[PDB]
């Protein structure tokens, strides 16, 4: 099996840093940027981190929230040739990393899933459909192990939230197909719920 | 100049398509997007294939149904858009 | 990363053996013995195997189909004390094991997930709701690596089929919450598709 | 007998401890009401008890807080 340590939500200090805005202004624009980028460099490689905490013996995924309805995992695009893990570390540091100059290494060990984007369009799937040779994006999900205590500096345009599994489960409407199946993908691990 | 190519197995790939089209003397394929179930990603067995020259359109209409892809004769239908 | 070899569906030949009937006759009879047994030996423990093959370089899960709509994984209930992995091997041999009586070898190195049943009703969840102390059933799923070729025998009352991932994904109405989430669960594995070289 | 105002992490065991802590070792069936879609405790259970036991909980329960919350007991 595989044993993962969880800690209470209140073990973590939420801070703020300066806002971090999406590279593109519109849905239409991001798919043309994807279209253009692919044709020079090929498949986009995205990595994302699943940070798990708990309250009351039940796991919570840390999500970033924009507005009312929009949710996303900390993560982002890999630069060409970049190692998967080394770049998720980078992306973690850039998103939630503290700025008071404390050391903060990210412990990223397990891959909890893969999602591919067949065309330049919203849909993604946990497999490469059989008519597709060159997916436009490959999204890889990693489990990030948290320290007993930590400070995340959350960019001011985002709001860091802990979603209990029951809120995510069978809730694609709320969270999309990737996040809503986090419960299922989390289920293989053996969680220890330390108390603080 | 767009053409629709259907009667494809759900495992007929874009690479499968460009080969066939190529081994027919067409080398001006512009675009290939399949039609897919949104929920699934599974291909509905037909695709839109853009082609650069009127001549290349004629070659696909006359010749592509003659060659079998994965045991099936493609069906070609010119786009009237 | 974690690499798994897949082989064409045609590499595996599926025989037929005598019917395997389920210990319970009605649904109401099933939840009754669960309650009965739970008092005696505690939480029911189930294990199930996910046997994967590929067609057209897309993974397919092997399912037992009972009638028109019912689908289930190969597996069953462990005996009390019985080891998780050895028990799945036992249950597999019972359900798909060949007859001519060659020892069939199973490879089970990977856990794909857990589902819990908080009550004595259908619902099962990939987690134990916080207000629950003593879940009535614990189902554990394993990846079962098939060899390059193999002979099985399918009980005459089931029909074994290989379901492509897209058939299962987002298809809870068709396959239930567990089977239908298999694609996501399978997604971390790096699959190698060995084609037929004849 | 209903008990509302429970936090979704109040267990079957938790509720047993509180009821026994109070002079009621006569508990009939207890049943949590839950969200079917995700299994979540809807925050209120229904319990079966003696009127000599019923009375002690409709007046005495709401004083002791379970998980930071005071139970709110109603009539079957």
HEC letters along chain B: CEEEEECCCCCCCHHHHHHHHHCCCCCCEEEEEEEECCCCCCEEEEEEEEECCHHHHHHHHHHHHHCCCCCCCCEEEECCC
For residues D14 and D7, give the distance between their C-alpha atoms in angstroms, rounded to a whole number. Answer: 11
Give the strand pairing for D2-4 and D72-73. antiparallel
Q: Is D2 in the C-facing interface, judged by CB distances under 8 Å? A: no
Whether residue C166 and residue B11 make contact (CB cut-off 8 A), yes or no, is no
Name the residue of chain B whose CA is nearest to C55's CA: B11
Whether residue B34 and residue A133 make contact (CB cut-off 8 A), yes or no, is no
Whether residue A56 and residue D9 make contact (CB cut-off 8 A), yes or no, is yes
Direct distance between the N- and C-terminal alpha carbons of chain B, in angstroms, rounded to an integer = 9
Q: Is D38 in the C-facing interface, judged by CB distances under 8 Å? A: yes
| Cross-strand bridge partners of residue A50 | A143
Name the residue of chain D whose CA is nearest to C135's CA: D12
Name the residue of chain C whose CA is nearest to D43's CA: C131
Query: What technique was this entry resolved by?
Result: X-ray
Q: Give D25's DSSP letter.
A: -
Number of Cβ within 10 Å of residue C138's Cβ equals 17
Name the residue facing C188 among A112, A128, A186 (closest C-beta). Answer: A112
Q: Vertex A82, ends A139 and A156: CA angle to 5°?
A: 65
Whether residue B41 and residue A123 make contact (CB cut-off 8 A), yes or no, is yes
Specify the fold of A2-196: Nucleoside Triphosphate Pyrophosphohydrolase (3.90.79)
Q: Is C57 in the A-facing interface, judged by CB distances under 8 Å? A: yes
Which has the closest alpha carbon to A31: A91, A117, A114? A117
Q: Is B71 in the C-facing interface, judged by CB distances under 8 Å? A: no
Say if CB B55 and CB B6 are below 8 A apart: no
Q: Is A38 left (phi over 0), alpha (psi -120 to 50) or beta?
A: alpha
Optimal mutation site among B8, B11, B12, B45, interface C, most CBs of chain C within 10 A: B11
Helix (H) or strand (E) holding D30: strand D30-34
For residues A81 and A62, give the distance between their C-alpha atoms in angstroms, rounded to a whole number. Answer: 28
Whether residue B15 and residue A130 make contact (CB cut-off 8 A), yes or no, is no
Name the residue facing D38 among A56, A57, A166 (closest C-beta). Answer: A166
Torsion angle of the four alpha carbons A81, A85, A91, A93, in this order, in degrees rounded to the nearest 10 = -130
Which domains, and CATH codes, for chain D? 1-76 (3.30.70.330)
Tell me which architecture the domain covering C2-198 has in CATH: Alpha-Beta Complex (3.90)
With 0-12 CB in 10 A as exposed, 13-18 as middle and 19+ as buried, what is C75? buried
- Measured over all CA atoms, what is the biggest interatomic distance in chain A, rounded to whole angstroms? 51
Optimal mutation site among B36, B39, B40, B44, interface C, most CBs of chain C within 10 A: B40
For residues C143 and C49, give the distance between their C-alpha atoms in angstroms, rounded to a whole number. Answer: 6
Tokens of residue A40, six digits: 């020079």
For residues D41 and A166, give the distance between their C-alpha atoms in angstroms, rounded to a whole number. Answer: 10
Total residues belonging to chain C: 198
Which residues have C-beta within 8 Å of that of residue D37, sequence separation ≥ 6? A169, A170
For residues C126 and A189, give the distance between their C-alpha atoms in angstroms, rounded to a whole number. Answer: 11
**Chains touching A, CB cut-off 8 Å, 3+ pairs:** B, C, D
CA distance D73 to chain A (A): 24
- Count C/D contacts: CB-CB distance under 8 Å: 32
Cα dihedral sign for A16, A18, A19, A21?
Answer: negative
For chain C, the domains span 2-198
Q: Give A125's DSSP letter.
A: B
Which residues have C-beta within 8 Å of that of residue C187, sequence separation ≥ 6? A113, A114, A115, A126, A127, A185
Q: Is D38 left (phi over 0), alpha (psi -120 to 50) or beta?
A: alpha
Q: Is D11 in the A-facing interface, judged by CB distances under 8 Å? A: no
Which has the closest alpha carbon to B48: B63, B24, B61, B30? B30
Name the residue of chain B whose CA is nearest to A130's CA: B11
| Cross-strand bridge partners of residue A114 | A140
Which has the closest alpha carbon to C18: C124, C167, C158, C127? C158
SS3 A190: strand
Chain A residues touching chain D at CB-CB below 8 Å: 55-58, 166-167, 169-171
Say if CB C47 and CB C87 are below 8 A apart: yes
Which has the closest alpha carbon to A137: A117, A113, A120, A119? A117
For residues A118 and A104, give the distance between their C-alpha atoms in angstroms, rounded to a whole number. Answer: 36
With 0-12 CB in 10 A as exposed, 13-18 as middle and 19+ as buried, what is D68? exposed
DSSP string, C89-137: HHHHHHHT--SS-PPPP-EEEEEEEEEEE-SSSS--BSS--TT-SS-SE
Name the residue facing D39 among A55, A166, A171 (closest C-beta). Answer: A166
- Count B/C contacts: CB-CB distance under 8 Å: 14
CA distance C193 to chain B (A): 14
Quickly tell me which residue has 């008092």 as its tokens: C39
Q: Kindly provide the resolution of this structure in angstroms, with one decimal.
A: 2.7
């Amino acid at each position: 099996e595989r044993t993962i340590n969880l800690y209470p939500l209140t073990n973590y200090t939420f801070g703020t840093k300066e806002p971090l805005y999406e590279k593109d202004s519109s849905v239409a624009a991001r798919f043309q940027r994807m279209r253009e980028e692919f044709d020079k460099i090929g498949m986009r490689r995205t990595v994302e981190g699943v940070l798990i905490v708990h309250e009351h013996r039940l796991p919570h995924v840390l999500l970033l929230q924009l507005g009312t309805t929009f949710f996303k995992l900390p993560g982002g695009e890999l630069n060409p040739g970049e190692d998967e893990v080394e770049g998720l570390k980078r992306l973690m540091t850039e998103i939630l990393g503290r700025q008071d100059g404390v050391l903060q290494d990210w412990v990223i060990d397990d891959c909890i899933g893969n999602w591919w984007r067949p065309n330049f369009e919203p849909p993604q799937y946990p497999y490469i459909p059989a008519h597709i040779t060159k997916p436009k994006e490959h999204k890889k999900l990693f489990l990030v192990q948290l320290q007993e205590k930590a400070l995340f500096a959350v960019p001011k345009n985002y709001k860091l939230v802990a979603a209990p599994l029951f809120e995510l489960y069978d809730n694609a409407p709320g969270y999309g197909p990737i996040i809503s199946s986090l419960p299922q993908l989390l289920s293989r691990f053996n969680f220890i719920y330390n108390l603080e | 100049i767009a053409l629709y190519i259907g009667n494809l197995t759900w495992w007929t790939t874009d690479e499968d398509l460009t080969e066939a089209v190529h081994s027919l003397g067409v080398n001006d394929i512009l675009e290939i997007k399949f039609f897919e179930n949104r929920a699934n990603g599974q291909s509905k067995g037909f695709a839109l294939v853009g082609v650069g020259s009127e001549a290349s359109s004629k070659k696909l209409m006359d010749l592509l149904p003659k060659r079998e892809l994965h045991g099936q004769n493609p069906v070609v239908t010119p786009s009237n858009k």
